[PDB]
Design a protein around this ligand. Structure first.
Ligand SMILES: C[C@@H](C(=O)O)N(C)C(=O)OCc1ccccc1
Length: 330
């Protein structure tokens, strides 16, 4: 089997991408944030505290003839940005782009933190990291991909995120028309539960490539590119007037600037992030100061190849026995 679904930016900055997901019978379609940095499929629901729902579409398990409460199971998750959610668990039929999994754990939110409430466009998350990170207790549950992978034509999914435009998540096949030149694969460590890999270095604009190992995670659920402070300083030094602001929470730059590209290495291959992809717009409405798309990871504990990096590539998440990542230009 295969599936293919369009993923759409939630706003004009590509802050996140939503993908329609069919849950239950008859289908209830919710727009979920596909997150290769986490492993829970959770949704706003009829059980979510009413004051914490503000425009999201909800899953109502009582209206699904295939929903079954997973007795005794609870979940609770906290994300790197400080947001969180928790609740109970149903199993139900879940389909993405024509690919159907029966008995998928659908984690129904009883509580969500304010950042989720305040974003009416995201109805939940669909985790695509390794199932070892799933938070369901006392019986950990499998991700959608883990449940589907034995049925897929090939045990892979691909992320093809658009710049200020829709893109595609495919399951079970590699669309050879969706990229240019060849797919360069690299080794993954699953020891922390992430799609963790080592970039071979970077370049700023037309500058020389610096060969240096940068361990990080491929994370579709993170907006920006978080890299070591040395790398980030080297990038922003090429932008007149750019500085790190403790007040704002990162590097800012004149909105009048033309940003240089940023290149990262994948083995001997190179992925070029155009400068425009690094512009996240005014820090506040009407400000002439803009928020950078490359930021320091120093306070995180891990480097994160988020959407800024991934949307410059066609990315293969190879979930074979010995997992790997592939990157192609497009
Ligand atoms: C030969 C290899 C390399 O980079 O040395 N290469 C080009 C390549 O794509 O290797 C990807 C891979 C990593 C780990 C396990 C299986 C496959």
């Amino acid at each position: 089997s295969t599936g293919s679904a369009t993923t759409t930016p939630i706003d004009s900055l590509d802050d996140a991408y939503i993908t329609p997901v069919q849950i239950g019978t008859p289908a209830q379609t919710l727009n979920l944030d596909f997150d290769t940095g986490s492993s829970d499929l959770w949704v706003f629901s009829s059980e979510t505290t009413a004051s914490e729902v503000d425009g999201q579409t909800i899953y109502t398990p009582s209206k699904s003839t295939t929903a079954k409460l997973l007795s005794g199971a609870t979940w609770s998750i906290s994300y790197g940005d400080g947001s969180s959610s928790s609740g109970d668990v149903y199993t139900d039929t879940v389909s993405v782009g024509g690919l159907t999994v029966t008995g998928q754990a659908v984690e129904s939110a009883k509580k969500v933190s304010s950042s989720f409430t305040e974003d009416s466009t995201i109805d939940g998350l669909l985790g695509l990291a390794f199932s070892t990170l799933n938070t369901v207790s006392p019986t950990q549950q499998k991700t959608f991909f883990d449940n589907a992978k034995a049925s897929l034509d090939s045990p892979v999914f691909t992320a093809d995120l658009g710049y200020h435009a829709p893109g595609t998540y495919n399951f079970g096949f590699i669309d050879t028309t969706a990229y240019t030149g060849s797919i360069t694969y690299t080794a993954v460590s699953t020891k922390q539960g992430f799609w963790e890999w080592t970039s071979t270095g970077y370049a700023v604009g037309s500058g020389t490539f610096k060969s240096t190992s940068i361990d990080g995670i491929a994370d579709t659920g993170t907006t920006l590119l978080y890299l070591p402070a040395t790398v980030v300083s080297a990038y922003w030094a090429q932008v007149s007037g750019a500085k790190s602001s403790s007040s704002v929470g990162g590097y800012v730059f004149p909105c009048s600037a033309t940003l240089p590209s940023f290149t990262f290495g994948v083995g001997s291959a190179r992925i070029v992030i155009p400068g425009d992809y690094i512009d996240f717009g005014p820090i506040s409405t009407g400000s002439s100061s803009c928020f950078g798309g490359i930021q320091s990871s120093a306070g995180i504990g891990i480097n994160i190849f988020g959407d800024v990096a991934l949307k410059a590539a066609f990315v293969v998440f190879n979930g074979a026995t010995t997992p790997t990542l592939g990157f192609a230009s497009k």
